[PDB]
C-alpha cells in the first residue's frame, strides 16, 4: 500500500507533558459470548493510537511496527497480576483525538470494567513483547503498563484466556 496522502499533526493535550515515541493502529476483537463460534468475520475494531513517553524515557520505539493486536480479558482476574503491574513502565495513548465512535466503543467496554492485553509482533532486538491498554474512567486517559518483567506476564495472561 503506497501511502501517498500520509497524514500529519495530532499533539492535541490529554497528557501533561510528554514526547511521541509511537503513532500505528491497534487492533482488536470484542468477546460478546464465551461460546458462539468465535472466528473471521467478528466484531472487528481499530483505532490509530499514539503512546506518549516521559521524554528522556528509555523506550526508543522506532522498529516497531505500523499495526499492534490487542486482546480484550475482564479485569477481575487480573487482580491475580498485582505484582505485574506494579514492576511495570506506565506510558499513555492518546489515540489520536478522543470523540472517535470506535474509540467510545473501547469506552464503553472498559467502562463495563475489562482490560486490553496488547501482544507486539517483531518489533525491535530484545525490548518489548507485550503491555496492558487500561483506561482510567477517573482521570479520561488510556493507560499503558509495560512489565519490565514481560515472559512471566504473558504466563499470566494465558491462563486469563480460559472461558
Not at 21 to 41: I, R, Y
Not at 135 to 159: A, E
Amino acid at each position: 500500500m503506497g501511502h501517498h496522502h500520509h497524514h500529519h499533526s495530532h499533539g492535541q493535550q490529554s497528557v501533561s507533558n510528554k514526547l511521541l515515541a509511537w503513532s500505528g493502529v491497534l487492533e482488536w476483537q470484542e468477546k460478546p459470548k464465551p461460546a458462539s463460534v468465535d472466528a473471521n468475520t467478528k466484531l472487528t475494531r481499530s483505532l490509530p493510537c499514539q503512546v506518549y513517553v516521559n521524554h528522556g524515557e528509555n523506550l526508543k520505539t522506532e522498529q516497531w511496527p505500523q499495526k499492534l493486536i490487542m486482546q480484550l480479558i475482564p479485569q477481575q482476574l487480573l487482580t491475580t497480576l498485582g505484582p505485574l503491574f506494579r514492576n511495570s513502565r506506565m506510558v499513555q495513548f492518546h489515540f489520536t483525538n478522543k470523540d472517535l465512535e470506535s474509540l467510545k466503543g473501547l469506552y464503553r467496554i472498559m467502562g463495563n470494567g475489562f482490560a486490553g492485553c496488547v501482544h507486539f509482533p517483531h518489533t525491535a532486538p530484545c525490548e518489548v513483547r507485550v503491555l496492558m491498554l487500561l483506561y482510567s474512567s477517573k482521570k479520561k486517559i488510556f493507560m499503558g503498563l509495560i512489565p519490565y518483567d514481560q515472559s512471566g506476564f504473558v504466563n499470566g495472561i494465558r491462563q486469563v484466556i480460559t472461558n
